[PDB]
Enzyme design. Sequence first.
Site, PDB file in Angstrom:
ATOM      1  NE  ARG A  54      -4.016   1.612   2.098  1.00 12.57           N
ATOM      2  CZ  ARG A  54      -4.426   3.112   2.795  1.00 12.57           C
ATOM      3  NH1 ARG A  54      -3.134   3.202   4.215  1.00 12.57           N
ATOM      4  NH2 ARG A  54      -5.435   3.861   2.949  1.00 12.57           N
ATOM      5  CG  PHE A  59      -0.928   8.774   3.707  1.00 15.38           C
ATOM      6  CD1 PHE A  59      -0.292   9.249   4.780  1.00 15.38           C
ATOM      7  CD2 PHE A  59      -1.596   8.319   3.597  1.00 15.38           C
ATOM      8  CE1 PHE A  59      -0.991   8.735   5.783  1.00 15.38           C
ATOM      9  CE2 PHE A  59      -2.490   7.378   4.713  1.00 15.38           C
ATOM     10  CZ  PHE A  59      -2.211   8.188   5.961  1.00 15.38           C
ATOM     11  CD  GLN A  62       0.055  -0.309   5.958  1.00 17.32           C
ATOM     12  OE1 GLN A  62      -0.702   0.791   6.143  1.00 17.32           O
ATOM     13  NE2 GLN A  62      -0.773  -1.777   6.889  1.00 17.32           N
ATOM     14  CG  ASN A 101      -2.905   0.140  14.844  1.00 20.72           C
ATOM     15  OD1 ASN A 101      -4.047   0.702  14.752  1.00 20.72           O
ATOM     16  ND2 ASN A 101      -1.444   1.274  16.244  1.00 20.72           N
ATOM     17  CG  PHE A 112       3.242   3.527   9.157  1.00 21.22           C
ATOM     18  CD1 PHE A 112       2.541   2.887   9.712  1.00 21.22           C
ATOM     19  CD2 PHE A 112       3.199   4.683   8.492  1.00 21.22           C
ATOM     20  CE1 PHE A 112       1.998   4.307  10.513  1.00 21.22           C
ATOM     21  CE2 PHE A 112       2.910   5.656   9.211  1.00 21.22           C
ATOM     22  CZ  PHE A 112       1.979   5.193  10.481  1.00 21.22           C
ATOM     23  CG  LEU A 121      -0.887   9.021  11.432  1.00 20.00           C
ATOM     24  CD1 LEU A 121      -0.308   8.062  10.471  1.00 20.00           C
ATOM     25  CD2 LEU A 121      -1.936   8.444  11.787  1.00 20.00           C
ATOM     26  CG  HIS A 125      -0.639   4.119  13.450  1.00 15.59           C
ATOM     27  ND1 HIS A 125      -1.282   3.149  12.946  1.00 15.59           N
ATOM     28  CD2 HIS A 125      -1.154   4.915  13.069  1.00 15.59           C
ATOM     29  CE1 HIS A 125      -2.334   3.226  12.845  1.00 15.59           C
ATOM     30  NE2 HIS A 125      -2.465   4.264  12.568  1.00 15.59           N
TER      31      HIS A 125
END
EC number: 5.2.1.8
Length: 164
Positions: A54, A59, A62, A101, A112, A121, A125
């Site tokens: 991903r 951004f 991942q 997660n 990521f 985040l 995370h």
Amino acid sequence: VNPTVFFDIAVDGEPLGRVSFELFADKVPKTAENFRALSTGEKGFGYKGSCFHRIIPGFMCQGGDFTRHNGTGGKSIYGEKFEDENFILKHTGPGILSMANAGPNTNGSQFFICTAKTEWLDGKHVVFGKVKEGMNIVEAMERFGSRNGKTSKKITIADCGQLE
């Protein structure tokens, strides 16, 4: 004292380059040790040969689903998903390494790499490392992502392990 690990990245099987990470074992030892072990393969499983499934430009990239290769799998070295160690470190810009997660205290092997500041985040995370060398390789990987995260070429971890 903080460990250093490397990924050798490939794009549709052709070598692209090496990314290295500093893992913050001083501050998040359980989360750093999980990543370090998965990168060396010393438990008999880990990141070697897995893909970044991903990729969203601007951004994050991942990866770490070495079991199902699509975001639904992965496992920690602890025999179970493990707790959020702490949220001392924040998502402060490109290069931050952070655990993916499925809600509170569900860390496995997926992680990521931020390619921007992702402050939303924070507290969700666990940040546990940062890109040390090869941010330009992460930038090259980013260009094979897309708005919905689908990669246009297969981005693999052709080799990985511990440095120094």
